[PDB]
């Protein structure tokens, strides 16, 4: 909870002292519902051939 | 990948670096923390032996059994065979109705063992079960051609093994060497693991020696012998 004055505060990215510890302590950022950007038809067909054709 | 893990003393000191300045030189507190954390780091190192203990070329024991049950070839199989039984032949010789074992035989089984009580010959030597799994990889993929059955036989038996004839529905193989008793007893299980197309019958050369004839790859007067295919009785008593 973090309200207990006898315990440490919760690790969070904002109060971490390093980039590495910020990554380790990142509680998670949750965007809302997302819509993916569509891929143009020729590029999409090319990428799909590259992946799922062999 | 590469080295998954590092020495525990490296991880523990990497964490000790994060101690406060006011404790940087507290040998009792620092050593207490080291005692408590080095044990956890050492406990977790033991996992970095779950990496190549499952390598098919070097696995042993339960790690090889697990690979076998992934590949669908168990260590033991029903057969038409009087498996040797560990025990005493009343010294010189006793009549009895069993055959006895002497501290070095693949047919390790007691009277009370469950696989034995229902005729399941169980492969105990790792160097033979490993070969059987390597061959099973070919049944897996359906690699029934000669160009693959030959590598199946090289792994099971040796460099001198070869595939001889392709009649109508019947294919002959030879180890190319005298077989030891362990290999002879496990032979019925070898023909359950080899990549031979269903509906086609596997044979075996009588003398397990290289076959003779003409052309480039065979054996001549010295070393070769005349062909004679015989039924290994891999699935039947008859």
């Amino acid at each position: 909870d973090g309200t207990d004055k006898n315990k440490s505060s919760n690790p969070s990215k904002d109060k971490a002292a390093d980039a590495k510890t910020a990554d380790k302590a990142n509680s998670g950022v949750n965007a809302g519902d997302k819509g993916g950007t569509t891929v143009a038809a020729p590029r999409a067909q090319s990428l799909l051939k590259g992946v799922f054709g062999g | 990948m590469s080295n998954l893990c590092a020495d525990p003393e490296a991880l523990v000191e990497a964490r000790i670096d994060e101690v406060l300045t006011q404790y940087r030189e507290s040998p009792y507190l620092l050593n207490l923390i080291r005692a408590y954390l080095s044990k956890l780091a050492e406990t977790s190192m033991s996992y970095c032996d779950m990496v190549e203990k499952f390598d098919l070329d070097t696995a042993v024991g339960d790690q090889l059994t697990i690979i076998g049950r992934i590949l669908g070839f168990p260590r033991c199989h029903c057969v038409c065979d009087t498996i040797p039984v560990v025990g005493y032949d009343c010294g010189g010789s006793y009549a009895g109705s069993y055959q006895l074992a002497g501290y070095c035989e693949p047919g390790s089984s007691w009277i009370h063992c469950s696989p034995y009580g229902n005729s399941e010959l169980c492969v105990d030597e790792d160097e033979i079960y490993r070969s059987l799994l390597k061959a099973r990889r070919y049944q897996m993929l359906g690699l029934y051609d000669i160009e693959s059955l030959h590598e199946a036989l090289q792994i099971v038996w040796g460099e001198d093994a070869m595939v001889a004839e392709t009649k109508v529905g019947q294919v002959v193989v030879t180890p190319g060497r005298s077989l030891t008793a362990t290999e002879t007893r496990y032979l019925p299980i070898v023909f359950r693991a080899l990549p031979i197309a269903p509906g086609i019958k596997g044979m075996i050369h009588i003398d397990q020696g290289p076959i003779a004839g003409y052309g480039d790859g065979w054996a001549g007067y010295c070393g070769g012998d005349w062909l004679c295919p015989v039924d290994p009785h891999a699935y039947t008593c008859s």
């Binding site: - | 005692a35 790690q63 099973r136 029934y144 529905g169």
Partner: protein, 299 residues
């Protein structure tokens, strides 16, 4: 290092061993005069960290058993099967799906790939695979060097497209139903068996054999329902399986060991039950009805 991954499995370091190691570390740090009793400030810390170390051992065992089909469960059980590219059936249990991956006997490890892929088809209620690999026709009627398949359900197109890729060219098929298949223009005619169901009427005369005058045999209905379940299960009698006294006794005693089967009686319905055997051809199967089975206790 006897612990961890060992030829016999993952060997766990006991909690007591963990705690002893921690205490040995603390004796060297503080001296022989240190107090570590289970109720002291230091003893409590040693307990907490020993528990944490043993919990790490637990995770190690979990990670080792996650690669063992006999212990793997769920999506990782599916990922393990993806090595042979097997697939689970709908509603299938972990026990069932692990038996397929392990190929428990199967009596012939070969053609198990075909046996399991067949069972993975949608609609296939029952399936069975047979082989005649000699240079002579067997008594069952299968020509030499032939693969026979018996299947109930599933569309013929899917069944045949599946069987074609498991049965190699040059090996025939024996059956009563023909399916024409085409890949790349080449047409192979796949023959399978769609067993003809012969309704069988069954009447059993049993005796009661209480094991040390204890739990007595169950009621007649409680036995006929069980026998029907056994005969309708996946271990139902196969094609070309004649109905014999042995076949039914081996089921009745197994289900109810406190009962002796005296007289089995069978017939092709609606005809009257009579003396076995009831001969079923290789294309015929016995089909049972929950009413036709009757059991009678005899003095």
């Amino acid at each position: 290092m006897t612990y961890g991954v060992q030829p016999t499995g993952y060997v766990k370091k006991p909690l007591a061993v963990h705690l002893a190691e921690i205490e040995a570390s603390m004796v060297d740090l503080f001296g022989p005069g240190v107090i570590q009793t289970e109720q002291s400030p230091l003893g409590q810390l040693n307990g907490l960290y020993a528990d944490l170390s043993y919990d790490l051992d637990e995770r190690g065992e979990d990670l080792y058993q996650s690669f063992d089909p006999e212990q793997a469960e769920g999506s990782r059980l599916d990922i393990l099967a993806r090595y042979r590219l097997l697939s689970r059936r709908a509603g299938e249990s972990d026990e069932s799906f692990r038996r397929a991956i392990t190929n428990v006997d199967r009596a012939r490890i070969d053609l198990s790939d075909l046996s399991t892929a067949l069972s993975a088809i949608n609609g296939v209620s029952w399936s069975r695979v047979y082989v005649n690999e000699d240079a002579t026709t067997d008594a069952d009627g299968i020509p030499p060097n032939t693969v026979s398949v018996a299947v109930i359900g599933g569309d013929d197109d899917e069944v045949a497209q599946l069987v074609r890729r498991y049965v190699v060219p040059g090996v025939g098929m024996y059956g009563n139903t023909t399916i024409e298949t085409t890949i790349g223009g080449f047409c192979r005619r796949i023959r399978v068996i769609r067993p003809v169901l012969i309704p069988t009427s069954v009447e059993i005369d049993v005796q009661s054999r209480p094991l040390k005058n204890g739990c007595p045999p169950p009621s007649v209905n409680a036995m006929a329902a069980g026998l029907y379940t056994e005969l309708t299960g996946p271990d139902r009698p196969g094609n070309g399986e004649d109905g014999t006294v042995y076949l039914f006794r081996k089921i009745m005693e197994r289900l109810y060991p406190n009962v002796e089967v005296v007289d089995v009686r069978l017939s092709q319905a609606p005809a009257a039950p009579t003396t076995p055997p009831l001969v079923m051809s290789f294309f015929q199967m016995m089909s049972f009805n929950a009413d036709d089975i009757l059991v009678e206790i005899v003095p």
